[PDB]
């Protein structure tokens, strides 16, 4: 080959390969080339520097020179060609302004959000409304006592987080003003977070999942009521011993690397951070506990009208219009403070402002009581994706497979056991029976689609073997009913 084209880092022409891709950056001083992963830059920096000085230079040349902030109202704040374009919703200019009028956004009705003082009052109100099987409104619980939600004692902060997870642990982080996600070392984030006075750019990570860290996973957990209704938790129980063995004896075992891991997240964001409107992936529900700081959520109920506005909003090229302004007064304001907890059921559209540096623990989960709404959000996502192109990692992992597994391992078993007696399921398991029908119908559609345009882990043949068995037991039970 040719020497000039050898990476001055790993000293090779081809990198070994988080993921380098096949990308290089050149030093503006010595002109040698480095693979991105060999340059000493982290992904969040790939676009910041107008002049890059490699580590070999930079004692004798100085730090890399970053682009000038030419257009604070654009995601491309560094591009002169955009100076004259419109103010974009995520931008620094936009957020400054939005901060001065955000408190005019109206408060919710009692139909939309129920505020309660503690988990005991939450429990009573939750039950008045039909519980999880009929969960439709958001709850804000001022004091976590009664929720059975394991959390770290105050005094716990970002410092303990980086110590437990490790300095080099990489988290996907939001570059607020750019409205994009890049990788950043936990140590790098902490450094920027500590420099309270100098913040050219704001960062906010939402995506630090720690259910696989043996220390962290005991320090912050979902409320008990959530662990009890979580579909993922039902399928990959964290059991041991004979429970686990039986889990193996039945073919109910599932690979740890197949598990959707979205139930234990830590979030940390700088004051002035803004996350724009979205519905959480798979239409999952959310528990959200503020350890430190403050959050302002802007929320809209999951109605067909709101979804149509939202779907249009997401597929439109436009970037200058705040969803709240085209949503016909649907958007409501709810402030959440330190120690307080938000519980959001499937489908709620929401954005969030971070008025103050914050540390949050939360998680996403699916449950039978919101099965219909979850499927409705799946359709919404699928429609949006037909338009714009997105990345898999912003969606619910193994969404479809989870349902095959849940139908096979959970619901089929229950309808079969019911069927083997006279048991009319409507007596002690009406909810199980209605969930089965809803899931079945949605799965029929998935089969039909697969037979039309082929597959994309579970062979087509296996799926078909599950469906026939489900149809059978379902028909058996409805005869037991018509009787």
């Amino acid at each position: 080959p040719k020497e000039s084209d050898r990476c001055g880092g790993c000293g090779k022409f081809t990198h070994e390969d988080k993921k380098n891709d096949f990308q290089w950056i050149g030093c503006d001083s010595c002109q040698t080339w480095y693979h991105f992963l060999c340059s000493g830059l982290e992904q969040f920096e790939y676009y910041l520097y107008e002049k890059f000085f490699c580590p070999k230079c930079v004692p004798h040349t100085g730090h890399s020179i970053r682009y000038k902030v030419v257009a604070p109202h654009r995601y491309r704040w560094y591009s002169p060609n955009e100076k004259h374009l419109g103010i974009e919703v995520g931008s620094k200019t936009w957020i400054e302004d939005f901060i001065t009028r955000e408190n005019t956004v109206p408060s919710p009705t009692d139909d939309e959000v129920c505020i309660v003082e503690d988990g005991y009052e939450f429990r009573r109100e939750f039950e008045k409304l039909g519980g999880a099987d009929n969960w439709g409104k958001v709850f804000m619980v001022k004091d976590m006592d009664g929720l059975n939600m394991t959390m770290p004692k105050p005094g716990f902060d970002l410092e303990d987080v980086v110590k437990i997870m490790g300095s080099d642990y990489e988290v996907d982080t939001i570059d607020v003003y750019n409205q994009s996600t890049y990788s950043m070392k936990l140590d790098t984030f902490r450094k920027l977070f500590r420099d309270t006075k100098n913040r050219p750019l704001l960062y906010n990570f939402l995506s630090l999942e720690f259910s696989d860290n043996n220390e962290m996973k005991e320090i912050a957990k979902p409320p008990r009521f959530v662990q009890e209704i979580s579909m993922v938790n039902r399928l990959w129980p964290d059991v041991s011993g004979a429970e686990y063995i039986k889990l193996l004896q039945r073919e109910e075992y599932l690979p740890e690397d197949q598990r959707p891991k979205v139930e234990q997240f830590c979030l940390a964001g700088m004051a002035g951070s803004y996350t724009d409107f979205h519905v959480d992936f798979g239409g999952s529900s959310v528990y959200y506990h503020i350890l430190k700081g403050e959050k302002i959520f802007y929320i809209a109920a999951p109605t067909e009208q709101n979804f149509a506005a939202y779907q249009a909003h997401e597929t439109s090229p436009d970037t200058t219009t705040w969803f709240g302004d085209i949503a016909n007064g649907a958007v409501k304001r709810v402030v959440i403070k330190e120690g307080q907890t938000l519980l959001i059921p499937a489908g709620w559209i929401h954005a969030v402002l971070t008025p103050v540096d914050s540390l949050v623990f939360g998680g996403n989960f699916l449950h039978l009581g919101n099965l219909e709404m979850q499927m409705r959000v799946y359709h919404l996502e699928n429609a949006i994706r037909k338009e714009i192109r997105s990345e898999e990692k912003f969606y619910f992992p193994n969404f479809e497979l989870l349902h095959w597994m849940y139908m096979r391992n959970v619901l089929l078993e229950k309808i079969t056991e019911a069927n083997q007696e006279g048991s009319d399921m409507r007596e002690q398991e009406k909810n199980i029976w209605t969930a089965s029908q809803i899931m079945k119908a949605e799965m029929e559609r998935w089969m039909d689609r697969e037979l039309r345009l082929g597959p994309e882990i579970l062979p087509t043949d296996d799926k078909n073997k599950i469906m026939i068995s489900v149809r059978k037991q379902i028909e058996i039970q409805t005869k037991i009913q018509n009787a």
Partner: peptide
């Protein structure tokens, strides 16, 4: 369009 969002 859809990059600034929760990642798994």
């Amino acid at each position: 369009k859809q990059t600034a969002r929760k990642s798994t």
